[PDB]
Structure 1
């Protein structure tokens, strides 16, 4: 049952960088207890780039075991190599994950046709629901609406995460794919509209620090309650902007730490929120009420 507020869960590390299993458990209880509908473990925010193939599935395994069915658990499995996406995706299934989120290829700029037979292959090679992921801002390629529609017809491809933040884009994708095809938001700031457009959720970074609030806003958004959604949103907006004052998840982790939920750990090349951006974020957290 995959829709609503879906925290793009961070992967906590201790001061020396080793996975801190204690923080992960608490964070899972945290979202488990404050309304979160789903959890995306090992995604862009959970630092998928810098995890061992071994670390990858251990994080997917530990969350799945804790959640125990109460919520869906979506595993990040995209890769710029089809064979490597198969491996990760198969490793997520034989792990318990409820579904896989697969970003489009990143460095090597495939053709639209290539992205088609890329996801189509994985969807055929692994018997697990897969969710497309578009974010050209990171991966220097863009999966046009025509190609989304072709993939929507494929049997295991249940939905897509649209992160461009462009609302004419969601509109177009939504007006071409079935009622079965779930469109999710990957841009917190404009998620409310995507949902009012027919969107079925928001894979959020903001949910990491304001879980109860994000589920309320997705609820209202998907309920047709356009008044309430904005009301919350405009309250949360300053947090939406601050959390990206530096490439995500650098900021969201600083906050998580300032709340006392995770150690100060992050893997290279990533760095810790540089000095200059500390009060901008803290005021956003204080003004929004997630801190003190």
Structure 2
């Protein structure tokens, strides 16, 4: 199932900024062990912006090859050029990804019709399931529910990552699209509520550091055990907040390094988590039992 707790996996780098393959393999094994339901490679949290095209397909291939079909691997292949998006999605398909996640074009602010044309083109150009990704707080453009609705009728577009953390928006999307068209959260704090509304997973930053709890949270929320799901979520809340104390993935990378899982590399223009933030994050990690 392309559903449940789907980790938005970081891309580990050594201090020089080179890909750390060993650390990546360790993260994959961690996820397979702790109950994560799908891995999203080279998305926002995986620093897609600072990876070149060749590095991106390499990350995807290494993850695909290690996972060996045990859980779905989703490739972040979005771009603000339709031609570029087709190229990335094609690479990801040949590299054996199960599905691709495509952010709405950032920076260039396409019209609603332009977004339709973009996503519909990629959907017809490359025969791999595709998942939309709306994150206005990053792209500077908002794919409205009616546009999501029109795209939900396009063969090969199978779902949407809704990252606004606006639960009225979530509800409206869920009501407008078909039951086969899966709505996933991209906001850790509110994901539980999104799933209780009928959403079918969470593409999670927190799952990087608490995969078991997040896989438990999603399983509970998706079978309608609101009180159990909410109890896990309420417990995790200090951690959800602290992982955003600076722009993601700066905090989560610091957290994974503190846990001994990845080296201290992050690519400019991202910087290593500020000293003033170490304590708040560290004790949210202690409090939730990840450290």
* Fold shared per TM-score above 0.5: yes
Partner deviation per Cα, 1:31-89 (whole Å, 9 max, x = no partner):
01000000000000000000011100000000000000000000000000000000000
> 1:103: Cα distance to partner?
0.2
**What is the CA distance between 1:251 and its match in structure 2?**
0.4
Query: 2 CA distance for matches of 1:238 and 1:282?
Result: 11
> How many Å separate the matches in 2 of 1:234 and 1:193?
12
Cα distance per residue 1:93-138 (max 9 Å; x no partner) = 0000000000000000000000000000000000000000000000
Aligned residues: 291
Question: Any gaps of 5 or more consecutive residues in structure 1?
Answer: none
Structure-2 separation of matches of 1:91 and 1:238: 38
- Given the two structures, how large is their TM-score scaled by the length of structure 1? 0.99
Deviation per CA, 1:238-288: give whole Å up to 9, x if none: 000000000000000000000000000000000000110000000000000
1:267 lines up with 2:275 in the alignment = no
Deviating above 2 A after TM superposition, structure 1's stretches of 4 or more consecutive aligned residues are none
Q: Deviations over 1:14-33 (max 9, x none)?
A: 01111000000000000010
Please list every run of 5 or more consecutive structure 2 residues that lacks an aligned counterpart in the other structure: none
SS of the equivalent of 2:176 reads: coil
Query: In structure 1, the residue corresponding to 2:23 is in which secondary structure?
Result: helix
Q: Write the distance in 2 (CA, Å) between the matches of 1:16 and 1:157.
A: 38
Q: Secondary structure at the match of 1:59?
A: helix
Pairs within 5 Å for 1:1-292? 1-291=1-291
| Secondary structure at 1:175 match in 2 | helix
Q: 1:194, CA displacement in angstroms? A: 0.3
Find the aligned partners of 1:93 and 1:136 in 2 and give their Cα distance: 27
Distance 1:224 1:52 in 2: 41
Summarize deviations over 1:128-174 as a string: whole Å, max 9, x none. Answer: 00000000000000000000000000000000000000000010000
d(CA) in 2 for partners of 1:6 and 1:119? 22
Distance 1:162 1:20 in 2: 30
Deviations 1:189-217 (A, max 9, x none): 00000000000000000000000000000
